[PDB]
Each structure stands twice: as C-alpha cells, then as structure tokens.
Amino acid sequence: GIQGLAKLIADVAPSAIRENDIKSYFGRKVAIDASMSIYQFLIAVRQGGDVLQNEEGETTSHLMGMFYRTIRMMENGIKPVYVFDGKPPQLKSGELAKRSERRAEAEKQLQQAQAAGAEQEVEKFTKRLVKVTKQHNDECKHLLSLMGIPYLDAPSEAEASCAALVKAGKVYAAATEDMDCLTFGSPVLMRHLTASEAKKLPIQEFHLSRILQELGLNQEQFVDLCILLGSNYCESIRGIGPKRAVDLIQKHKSIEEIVRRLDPNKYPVPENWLHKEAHQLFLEPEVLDPESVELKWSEPNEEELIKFMCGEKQFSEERIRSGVKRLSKSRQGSTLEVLFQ
DNA sequence: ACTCTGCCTCAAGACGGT
DNA sequence: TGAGGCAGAGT
DNA sequence: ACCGTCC
Ligand SMILES: [K+]
Ligand SMILES: [Sm+3]
Ligand SMILES: [Sm+3]
Ligand SMILES: [Sm+3]
Ligand SMILES: [Sm+3]
Ligand SMILES: [Sm+3]
Ligand SMILES: [Sm+3]
Ligand SMILES: [Sm+3]
Ligand SMILES: [Sm+3]
C-alpha cells in the first residue's frame, strides 16, 4: 500500500477517478489479487467470530467467498483472472519483520483475552492473526480450476504482475483495493468491483494517465512521490507528508535532488535510505510474462465441484449446483468457444 | 494557518426467504 | 493487508 | 432491503 495515495488523488487529481455502472463492463477482463481476496474472506466470512468450516475442522470461508463472488462477476459478463503472490522481494523483509512483531505481540495478547474470559477481545486478536497459508492458496487454485476460471502464479508481488497484464493489454484493469498497482505502472486500477447485489459503493476506475497529467509528473517522478508518501519497501522522510511531498517532487523532480537541496537539520533523511532500491523495484519489478499463458474461461466441471464443495467441504448441494448452472450459463453468454483455422 | 505525527476507534462477504 | 477522527507539536 | 444463516 501507499500511505494516503487514495486520498491524495481525490484531493489534487479528481479527474483520474471515473465511476461507471456494472452493466457497462459486460465482456471485460480484469486481473484480481487472489491472496488479497482470500485474506478479506478469512476476516469477514465468519459466524459467531469463527470462520466457516466443515465438520473435519477445515476452513471454508475463503472457498465460500471465491465461489460466489466469482460467479457473480461472470453473471455480469466480467471475466476475472486470479493472480497469486509468489516469493516477496527482499526489500519487503523489513516490513515483514515488523509484521512478525505485531503478530507475536498480537499472539501475546490473544491468551490474556481467552484466559480472563474476554468477551469481544478474543475475536479482535483472532482477526489480527489471520494469515493466508499455502493450503488456502492451493484450495482456491483447485476450486478455480474446477470452475474453469484461469489463475496465474506471479514470481513475486501479485500486484506487479497484475499491472504487467494490464500494460500488455491482456486484461482491462487490475481489480484491487491497494493503490500499489498504480505505483507498479498499471494503466487502470478498479475499486469496489465485487459485483455484489448489495451495491453500496460505486465502481471506481483510477487512470494512471490522468494522475500523471493532473500532478504534472512522469512515472519515475510518480514512483518517487509514492516513496515519499510511504511504501512497504523503504522509509520516508519524517515531517514530509502528502502536501510537502507533492511540492518537493514537482519542484525537484527526483528524491536525489530533494536530498541535495534539503536542510539536514530541518528534514534529515533516514540513515542508509533504500529509496533507490525501492525506485528500481516499482519501475522494474519481477513479473510473469503476459505472453506465456493465454487466458481462457472454460466450462466448469459440475460433478467434481459437487464432490469437492459438497461431499468434502459440506456446502449445500442445492446452492452449489445452482451456482455452477448460473456460471455455465453466464460463460456461454459472454465467451466464444474456441475456433480452429 | 497549514502541515505532520501518533494516538484512538471502527470496519473488513454473500445467499436467500421474507 | 486501512480509513477517518482527534489532539498536540512542528513549519 | 432486512437479516438469519451459510459451513
Ligand atoms: K513521512
Ligand atoms: Sm502492495
Ligand atoms: Sm467463537
Ligand atoms: Sm479434508
Ligand atoms: Sm520496529
Ligand atoms: Sm503482495
Ligand atoms: Sm500485495
Ligand atoms: Sm497492495
Ligand atoms: Sm472429509
């Protein structure tokens, strides 16, 4: 994530945000950050503070959400490809070590809530410790295969590979809630694309070209601004927030020039600042090759889906069968069968 | 006045019968 | 892998 | 649309 970027764009670059009705997206392809989607389901899909599960004690909240949300998108003619995280970049090792502290610190506090018979504090440290395991990813990949929905393994950060799929024109936008994708150069970011029937927030498109235009920056200058706002890969400058960062970038263009012209006593920079390495990461990240795999939306395997979701994971057979039928019908409406010449 | 930091909290999905 | 709200301090 | 329920 980029600290405050969403608010900054709304304040100084409003024309980069465009809203459209769900009906206008029939036939459009999008890339989804699968790991983020799983994380959201593990936190939100709960009954009595506990994730859904089968009698064997196996979590099914992530399968619940991925099954029904994916079908809803396809019913609206939206064809998603799910991108799974790979090995994180080394620059993130600092941010991850921090996530270990707040995790061990959150573990340090879950017991005192349970021991003292806490009421609603147990459910808080529970959610705080949610983490997507490789079993979660493998089960979702398994589900998507049976649903006929394509997925991809990113070599590193999924958001970077999503951005690369948009750049190559293999999907229209990266559908996620983190502004990371824009810093990785995604031409289009889409927010609030759940295709739910609730419909509370409007579908928002963030267009990078409009952002660069209203801020008067090129991409490398935009990346330096995001570094000054605050990223996951390096430190920012204390006392430099969104208002001053924009002014400094617009005036000095680069972080290097900002340092040379900054007053060490007023605004000292971090010691051994890795802004140059984070700069290279955002602009030239390790990403999948968009030309390798041709994305295909295939017929779902209904009977295997029943065996897996119902027989093993104990979903309602009526609901799963109904869902598979809706998915097959919606794919037939939005997708052309393969042709040979 | 404007700006930034560090606290606080609050939320975080979807189906289907009504 | 948050977003606002608020008080207090720096500019 | 609300809300009990999903697993
Ligand atoms: K800062
Ligand atoms: Sm990110
Ligand atoms: Sm419980
Ligand atoms: Sm089992
Ligand atoms: Sm620390
Ligand atoms: Sm990631
Ligand atoms: Sm990520
Ligand atoms: Sm992100
Ligand atoms: Sm079993």
Author numbering: 2 to 342
Copy text verbatim from the article accompanying this structure deposition.
To obtain structures of hFEN1 with a ss 5′-flap substrate for insight into ss 5′-flap selection, we crystallized three hFEN1 active site mutants D86N, R100A and D233N with a double-flap (DF) substrate and with Sm3+. The third independent hFEN1-D233N crystal structure captures two cleaved nts from the 5′-flap bound on the other side of the tunnel from the dsDNA, consistent with threading. Asp233 is 3 Å from the attacking water and contributes modestly to catalysis; the D233N mutant has 16-fold reduced but still substantial catalytic activity compared to mutants of other invariant carboxylates, such as D181A21 and D86N. D86N, R100A and D233N mutations slow the hFEN1 catalysed reaction rate by factors of 530, 7,900 and 16 respectively. An ordered gateway and cap formed by helices 2, 4 and 5 are observed above the active site in these three structures. In all three substrate structures, the dsDNA major groove is widened as it approaches the active site, and DNA bases flanking the scissile phosphate are stacked with one another, with the +1 base packed against Tyr40.
